[PDB]
Design a protein around this ligand. Structure first.
Ligand code: FAD
Ligand code: FAD
Lengths: 427, 428, 427, 428
């Protein structure tokens, strides 16, 4: 019967944000569909010690509306622990607590529909809207949802280098780490492959028990250094509306060349952790020479499993321009995630703007179609820059989505916060 | 004419808090009276570098209700700078910003009445309520306000030692520092007298320009050391409902001895600042021997002004048990504040419970009468302990006041926040 | 045959300091006797994470003589790791590294005699000097050493409350913790009793594994709070020659009343650790209500072992003035150490100045006799104040010992470093 | 008359280091020549608040020999303040203190010859050694020094963009900042041009008094961001012998591309300072909109002085690829320093190995001749990488110089300090 103003497909932290922000808006009928039974965010990398890299004000709502009851501070109050959080005096939430908070919010909301796997989406020429075919996971029932606008907040999927595909059975991706940790620690050697925060957290986790179990503990990365995530406040001003307006110079190549070489700004390791790793190598080394190796500049060219019972990683050191091999029993592939458009998007291919490399040619308002109806959350890294996976700019993006969806500026979008001037400007 | 559910007398940060918390409550008609023309908090000490000692969640409302539009985060949002505050990533507001924030809140509110000096309060036996006689400061106009309940957020007054009263004209209390700074810095010698955060902030401020002007810069304190404010997280659990219950059940004599021995918990200097002062003495000393003196254990016994154009401070070093004199032109008296019950309370003396030392015998719900009608904000240090001047426990206190005023629990009041157990407690 | 200028009895870090400082002094013939086979300092509290509470410049020599080859910096250089230490950029040595450093120094020195248990000391009226009777631990051989002066750097011994003596067999002192940890963690409940750094380190160690094993983890202390060690720089000026001169007001009672109530200055917990404990309680509590109890103001009045298989601690909460009981299976008594004069001192009792409570009536130059010949290192807390167990004032004390022993001021003693004036002073 | 084992020309912190390290070596007769009257290091940038970017163990000697009496810790001891330094508990010396320390060392040494400008150097074929012709700055007297080996610690010179040369009289280089500060602060507008630590320190210094004087305070940089100096400990392992060996084996073209892409490793701003600048902009902005501008990606293409009494900076924003102009009265050119071989090196051109770009083809032992006799301190950035201006690798370099000069290894030279492996390396 009744057409929705928008349907959100996927309830990651971004669409969960949109949901908290959209619920109290007058005359906005929106619904969110997810296939899982509840919210559960990236639980394979929930080590006890792990925090977010982002202060708590980058919760679901506060940067758009601090008065929202879905705030992290309000959560803390309802759980009856806000004074403890006050005494803690720490800007950075534990991942476990953020996950608990997101679950509390998802439970409180009314506009979420869990256990709803979207199977196909199509544009109905006769009704002039989008038709979303779902399947209820608990009952099997088929249902169709009508909507003027879609907002695609699907997650990305685990990614390993192309040459590793034949050994998926042996190595463990970061996402499978916690489950296979006990099995890894029984091995003679472990190698973490990858540059980011996940790799570092894992490396630190294993380094903790290097004296307790046998293992050699290696870390190989393509990155030129173990670079920290750049957190100096003048650079943080680049994660801003003003910079994003600037960044829409509109020259795509520049954008793509900028995104390689701005990796300090989004793909870095938390500075504290790099230093904690050095300090732990130092402390462990007091009992004897440690059996560790750490390489940089190193691309994985090929790999192979030997009868011996070991991997042989062929590596290319790009700076030196010289190839070399390394061996390991255990292999943790902390190579992160890649977004690729979900199966259901096949049904609206001709309605989507694609760029030269067959990804979404995303517009400034986060839209993927030719009429401001199909929007995307995350997966605009190539055209909106390093700011896209940031929870800190979730409220910004959600606020402009709500502006497009509803016509009005529902949440005011702060477009002059920064001391710098980014574009050229004469006097 | 119309009887109020409660009247707040005084609009400091505590009653301004109560005001933000009470405004949206259904079936609560409250009003707040203050004699000043607007909110303007401790502007003599409002130095550019000065922060609050307390994270921003101890704003007017957040610890009772983070969704309130009077929150510091909402203020930051409406001013259009929340992202800058996010980048700053600092828990501690500048005093200048807190003051700007409190002013914004006071402006937004409807329940505040400025320029209204309360002159007398009395209990009307026939109407069975309190009668508050005010005077408009600008026009002189008399008005009477009727109310079932009062909440006294009058605040404490600046205090200097008894022997200093004859020289009020020459020395400067910390509260008047910024107005007299330029006049102090022209002098040959300045002496900060007192141990607290204000003393230290002033000492640091003056030490910054010791190179630039002539002055000798002295610091004398009665305190045994320049003790820091204890800010380790296990001690912060003592600023909790459970500790306050514990403290309030301890005999009257015990509580007073606790308040004199627990000055590191509330009357201390922020440890960063103590260290910044040492580091600045170190850096300044690289150009020559500094002209500074710092004494401890030293009680001011007497003072006097000489024809020469100098004070002579007579001091007694209590540990050594030996007297000595010191000289100074400028004198900053950073000796803090003392509460004494305001003039208007004379009219309800018979209705107030007094303890053995003629102060309010305050009950656990912050009430001073025999019927839960006259409440106090920040005059219960002697019965509720070191947590009383804390902005961090303003929402707690306001939340229990609102529970008494309106019989329901309007904002949830934690009974238990802490991992420690303070009172004795047997197992099984 | 030949009389020594001084003999040091005991080679703790204090006499080991004196030894490094005395070795290069011209015309000073001194020797140091210890019963153990080498240096090994307080190895029961060497947890991996534990640091000293004192910057590395408070090593054996640097505050008296930074050019000494026994410096921590020189140690780091000879081991070939000084650049690593530079990158670490941490003032506070790991206890394990300090111990390794002290061992390196002890090995390099020539004036140390290990495996030499002093059995008796006496004053020879005819030779007019001290006669020290030793026993070689490896060979059994008796030997006598002659000396004009003695410097007693014996360690203190483990101490538990008087009421605990009948249960020495069941509870574990902090010094026995590492050995009994595995046995403690199998129990249903553990209780750390005591206020200091040791108690806190242990509490943190056990709290780490509270989710992994069953246990209830309690902490009871007589202290009014879990007070931190006061490290603010204006208070650190009280650990200074100028303050020590002041502190010799000469009124003993004041000194004794000062030493209770100056416990923040020497008996505190490192601030970082208190906060790390709060932060870890916070993180653990995310999985469920934690089974922990923490009491303060609580004196242990009596204890008893029940047939049930549990201790019953009777406690008195001194502030509230109310008694209460608590139960626990495991009991870690982190009640620290007490010095008492060693057996051999019996032979020179009449030559030693004793005060009203039968401890050494120590003079300003650290001497215990009536002629500036018998000196003591540590064990002058009652008359020199909170500064005495500090490694930071080891060089100061050693420098004044060398001044008394040799007559000359061998190492200059810095007597005007402090911005404050401590005594009364008119103008 | 007497032939020296080596002569050091220039007494910067590097050759002053070599001097302290060489003095106690048996059978080493060395002497050091400098044209100035004493040691006085970068006094235009010696602001009260300014620290070194490098822990105190990177003093003149400690990383080669902590027992040396020229150590910073020994200095502190002789001055009678080591306990104060212990209480300070800060790894980073104030520049003023480092300067005082270097002066104390220079005074204690015997092997330094001040007021001695080297004018020409030549190789004597018959004596088989180097002949160094000096001129006494005070008296004009000529002297010739003979030596088997030279070590050139001349240092780099202040550098401004090519288009600025006609206005040297009006703008101020960072090196002349403290002398011209009072004159800058009288102006209506000031513009700091440049990205580095000096620029930032100056910008912070001026921002402090933006309230007090009129000025507009601008900051323009060619750099893409105000990048911090990378100080995370895994990256600090790149300042190591193993990394330097790795760097020096990379083809000439590769090394030059590395030195332009690795400016965060040596030409960055201290992260505390970047954040202190943001925090100070934040605090100042509480009184009104600040009159500041900050541009990035901006190359200075041209400049010109107008009759009005102002510069007009023409800038090109390289990322956007768009030109724009800006105006300023005061101009601080914080564009750093460049090495170019001093005049005297003309006389030994034929004896020096030159690379494809006419700079010294420096060998791994820091030598520039074909026989391990002419060495350089801090002119090998193009062949030994980003670690060259680091005081932290001064003792390393001095230790290998001493090994070449005297054939024995006088101070032990680490081959391997780091947990990482930088070059490719196969297993078995
Ligand atoms: C310089 C300074 C800094 C401080 N900083 C902090 C901090 O960072 N964090 C923290 O937790 N605590 C701090 N404190 C402690 C505490 O927060 C303050 O003392 C606070 O102002 C006290 O609260 P109040 O409501 O009593 O305030 P007050 O400012 O005393 O408010 C009282 C108001 O009532 C009015 N009044 C009095 N009598 C009458 C009458 N008869 N009729 C009408 N109006 C009347 C007064 O004019 C005034 O406006 C600080 C104190 C000082 C002095
Ligand atoms: C403001 C500033 C701060 C810095 N701070 C740090 C820091 O904290 N940490 C760090 O690691 N690095 C720092 N650096 C980088 C580096 O340490 C300095 O550039 C250093 O001064 C360079 O070493 P030098 O030996 O070349 O010194 P210089 O000071 O350049 O010494 C050269 C000397 O040789 C003399 N000379 C030149 N030609 C002749 C001649 N023909 N005859 C006689 N004498 C001659 C000069 O007069 C001068 O006295 C800083 C640089 C600057 C500009």
């Amino acid at each position: 019967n009744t057409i929705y103003d928008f349907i959100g497909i996927g309830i990651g932290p971004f669409n969960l944000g949109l949901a908290c922000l959209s619920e109290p808006v007058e005359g906005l009928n929106g619904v969110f569909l997810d296939q899982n039974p509840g919210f559960d965010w990236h639980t394979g990398m929930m080590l006890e010690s792990a925090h977010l890299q982002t202060p708590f004000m980058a919760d679901l709502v506060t940067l758009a509306d601090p008065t929202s009851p879905y705030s992290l501070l309000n959560f803390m109050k309802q759980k009856g622990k806000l004074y403890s959080f006050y005494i803690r005096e720490d800007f950075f939430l534990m991942r476990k607590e953020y996950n608990q908070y997101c679950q509390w919010a998802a439970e409180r909301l009314g506009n979420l529909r869990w256990n709803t796997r979207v199977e196909y989406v199509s544009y109905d020429d006769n009704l002039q809207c989008y038709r979303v075919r779902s399947t209820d996971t608990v009952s099997g029932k088929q249902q169709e949802w009508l909507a003027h606008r879609l907002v695609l907040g699907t997650g990305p999927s685990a990614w390993s280098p192309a040459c590793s595909q034949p050994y998926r059975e042996r190595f463990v991706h970061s996402s499978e780490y916690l489950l296979n940790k006990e099995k890894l620690q029984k091995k003679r050697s472990i190698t973490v492959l990858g540059s980011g925060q996940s790799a570092a957290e894992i490396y630190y986790d294993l380094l903790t028990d290097i004296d307790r179990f046998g293992y050699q503990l290696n870390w190989i990365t393509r990155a030129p250094r173990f670079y920290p995530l750049e957190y100096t406040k003048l650079t943080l001003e680049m994660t801003s509306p003003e910079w994003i307006d600037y960044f829409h110079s509109l020259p795509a190549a520049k954008r793509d060349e900028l995104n390689a070489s701005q990796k300090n700004l989004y793909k870095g390791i938390n500075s504290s952790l790099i230093n904690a790793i050095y300090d732990l190598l130092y402390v462990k080394q007091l009992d004897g020479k440690l059996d560790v190796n750490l390489f940089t500049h190193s691309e994985l060219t090929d790999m192979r499993w030997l009868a011996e019972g070991e991997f042989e990683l062929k590596l290319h050191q790009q700076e030196q321009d010289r190839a070399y091999s390394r061996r390991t029993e255990g292999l943790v592939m902390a190579t992160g995630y890649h977004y690729q458009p979900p199966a259901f998007v096949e049904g609206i291919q001709q309605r989507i703007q694609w760029d030269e490399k067959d990804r979404y040619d995303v517009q400034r308002n986060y839209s993927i179609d030719r009429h401001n109806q199909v929007f995307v959350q995350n997966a605009e890294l190539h055209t909106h820059g390093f700011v896209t996976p940031d929870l800190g700019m979730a409220c910004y993006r959600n606020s402009v989505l709500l502006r497009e969806i509803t016509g009005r500026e529902v949440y005011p979008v702060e477009r002059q916060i920064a001391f710098q001037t980014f574009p050229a400007q004469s006097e």
